[PDB]
């Protein structure tokens, strides 16, 4: 005791938000850079390779949702203990999270492996290509524990204000994956399965770094040991109260993404899907800096909640919205001004430009509801974050998108407008709910 991250969490909230979110936004951007790169190599492999990825993709997102959920529940719980100066508690949460990483990770592997065959067959696919999907699935499912472990380890680092090493772990992993991708796919001629091995190997190396920090170097604020160790049902409940709704939040988005597609089909057709997919993929690029700010918000408000300092919690929460609002203003202005240039660099051109001229508007009010959810997780109330996510993406997004298409003259335009109007309302409601929760904290 202590570390720079702990001093950061216990210091100025405005200084904490900036110094924590920046490494997170960078780490997530490099991860996005990998997806853009991998999307290029695989695209030139054929229709059989793309069909194999699409079959395991929902399963992949399922693993990620569970891994990231356990991670944020870990970071939130650790941040609150450190704020409350509960050293033994923070140490105990870290140990619990690592044990859960083994339990959750291996369970995913042993559950999906024998079920991955009939799953691909049920999704209207005979193999042929489904057989290629299994081989691709085996590799990634083999490292399900590695995935969850890396998210937990990253969660521990974020929990004690160590966004630096957390960023490093993300950069090393995605960076190595960017390197191995063309080598495994083309140079070695492994095809699309090579991309799986490249990902698996990059994850393993990342784990070797994390394990070295946590178990070998042991230079972390929290102390990790099984001596003598004691199972805590309160710590388990504290992690799952944030972790589980965090995973279900991703399920809500995925379900919502499915219905938004169906509405885009009826508008619509394959032409409507192509435009929506392209417009959404570009728009969600500006979401990345908001996510990094959300991860910082959870840790800072969590530490402030542990310190029983509502003023510090409110400051960090409102300051995170302010910065993210300014960033999105630059992002939205860039996209709308240079829409034909952006559409040209990612390619239905006429419909895509109009979509980019209307859709990314919601990014402006997005931070108002996303930081509220982030601070809800920070104080340990993940259920409110789940309810807010369900309301935003299922009730508002799908709701308004279904109305402007089936009840109005607007075609594809009604889809973008519905998504924009929908979550902007949820942004106001979410923000208002945040002010009510903070007012209740002052009285408590």
């Amino acid at each position: 005791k202590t570390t720079k991250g702990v001093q950061l969490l216990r210091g100025d909230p405005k200084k904490a938000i900036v110094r924590l979110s920046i490494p997170m936004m960078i780490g997530m951007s490099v991860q996005t850079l990998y997806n853009l790169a991998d999307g290029i190599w695989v695209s030139g492999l054929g229709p059989e390779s793309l069909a194999a990825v699409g079959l395991f993709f929902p399963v992949f997102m399922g693993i990620i949702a569970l891994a990231a959920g356990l991670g944020v529940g870990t970071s939130s719980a650790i941040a609150r203990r450190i704020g409350a100066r509960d050293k033994e508690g923070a140490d105990n949460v870290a140990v619990h999270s690592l044990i859960l990483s083994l339990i959750l990770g291996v369970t995913i592997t042993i559950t999906m492996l024998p079920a991955i065959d009939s799953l691909f067959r049920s999704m209207g696919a005979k193999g042929e290509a489904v057989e290629l999907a299994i081989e691709y699935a085996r590799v990634l499912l083999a490292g399900a524990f590695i995935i969850v472990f890396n998210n937990v380890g990253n969660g521990i680092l974020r929990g004690e204000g160590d966004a630096n090493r957390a960023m490093l772990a993300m950069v090393l992993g995605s960076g190595l994956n960017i390197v191995l991708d063309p080598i495994f796919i083309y140079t070695l001629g492994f095809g699309v399965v090579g991309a799986a091995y490249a990902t698996l190997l990059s994850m393993v190396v990342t784990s070797l770094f994390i394990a070295y920090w946590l178990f070998v170097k042991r230079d972390t604020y929290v102390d990790i040991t099984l001596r003598d160790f004691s199972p805590s049902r309160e710590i388990l409940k504290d992690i799952l109260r944030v972790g589980l709704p965090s995973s279900l939040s991703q399920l809500s988005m995925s379900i919502a993404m499915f219905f938004l597609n169906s509405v885009a089909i009826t508008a619509g057709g394959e032409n409507g899907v192509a435009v929506f997919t392209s417009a959404w993929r570009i728009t969600m690029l500006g979401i990345v800096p908001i996510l990094g700010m959300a991860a910082a918000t959870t840790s800072v408000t969590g530490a402030a909640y542990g310190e029983r300092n509502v003023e510090k919690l409110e400051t960090a929460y409102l300051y995170a919205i302010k910065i993210a609002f300014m960033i999105e203003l630059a992002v939205v202005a860039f996209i709308m001004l240079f829409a034909p240039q952006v559409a040209y660099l990612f390619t239905i051109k006429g419909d895509l430009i109009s979509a980019l001229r209307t859709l990314p508007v919601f990014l402006v009010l997005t931070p108002f509801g996303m930081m509220t959810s982030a601070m809800f997780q920070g104080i340990g109330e993940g259920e409110k974050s789940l309810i807010l996510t369900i309301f935003r993406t299922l009730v508002m997004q799908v709701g308004f998108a279904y109305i402007f298409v089936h009840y109005t003259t607007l075609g594809l335009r009604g889809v973008w407008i519905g998504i924009v109007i929908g979550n902007m309302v949820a942004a106001i409601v979410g923000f208002l709910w945040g002010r009510m929760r903070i007012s209740a904290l002052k009285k408590t």
Partner: peptide, 10 residues
Amino acid sequence: XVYSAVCLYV
């Protein structure tokens, strides 16, 4: 990437 579920594939 792996630490953020909502991206998603691209």
